[PDB]
Write a protein that binds this ligand. Structure first.
Ligand SMILES: CCCCCCCCCCCCCCCCC[C@@H](O)O[C@H](CO[C@H](O)CCCCCCCCCCCCCCC)COP(=O)(O)OCC[N+](C)(C)C
Ligand SMILES: CCCCCCCC/C=C\CCCCCCCC(=O)O[C@H](COC(=O)CCCCCCC/C=C/CCCCCCCC)COP(=O)(O)OCCN
Lengths: 70, 83
């Protein structure tokens, strides 16, 4: 009676544990991958991250400058 | 309208320097936007050649660009002479 009205079967806890373990393992793998990607992006500068501004080339004036040699 | 006229009349007495100052300053602020010669002053400033006019490479597609200074193409300064 106690088992029938207060508890469930073993398979429920078993499969809930499986799902929880899958989620946690995926999160750990993602954390490691994110750290490695951050290291590579900061070292190389070839990714979307750690982009530091340079002078906009639209500010340059392309006209004759009263002197032939610029 | 009576109060403003009374204030102006009372200020013109016993304070003419300030009245003249404000009148001249306001006129200097207002008149340039109404004068038609400010555009002429801008045009005169534009027509003063400080730099060398660098010629353009002709490709047969520029009829508006003269090939000699005496050619009738290009901007004119007859209006400046008539001023
Ligand atoms: C002959 C009898 C011998 C044995 C006597 C047994 C005595 C039993 C008292 C001990 C109770 C144990 C505590 C249980 C509370 C937690 C369990 C909980 O999960 O059960 C809930 C049920 O809650 C219970 O109703 C709680 C009972 C607590 C009340 C105790 C009774 C006496 C208290 C006195 C109250 C005040 C009296 C008035 C004074 C003026 C339903 O939850 P649920 O997630 O769905 O379960 C899923 C499993 N399913 C599928 C089977 C449903
Ligand atoms: C909108 C134009 C603004 C730009 C022009 C400004 C040019 C420079 C003028 C500003 C300089 C500083 C002005 C400081 C004002 C101080 C006023 C003040 O406190 O003086 C009062 C006295 O003056 C006053 O009463 C207050 C101001 C009076 C009105 C002044 C003129 C207001 C507008 C009149 C002209 C309007 C336009 C003219 C149109 C006429 C038609 C062309 C007290 O004087 P006391 O030294 O204490 O001596 C008193 C005891 N004997």
């Amino acid at each position: 009676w106690i088992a029938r009205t207060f508890y469930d079967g073993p398979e429920k806890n078993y499969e809930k544990t499986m799902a929880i373990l899958q989620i946690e393992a995926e999160k750990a793998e993602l954390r490691l991958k994110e750290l490695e990607v951050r290291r590579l992006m900061r070292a190389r500068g070839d990714g979307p991250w750690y982009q530091y501004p340079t002078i906009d080339k639209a500010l340059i004036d392309h006209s004759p400058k009263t002197t032939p040699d610029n | 309208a009576g109060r403003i006229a009374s204030f102006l009349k009372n200020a013109w007495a016993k304070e003419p320097v300030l009245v003249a100052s404000f009148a001249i300053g306001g006129l200097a602020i207002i008149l340039p936007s109404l004068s038609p010669y400010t555009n002429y002053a801008i045009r005169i400033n534009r027509a003063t050649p400080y730099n060398y006019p660098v010629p353009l490479r002709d490709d047969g597609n520029m009829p508006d660009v003269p090939s000699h200074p005496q050619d009738p193409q290009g901007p004119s300064l007859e209006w400046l002479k008539n001023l």
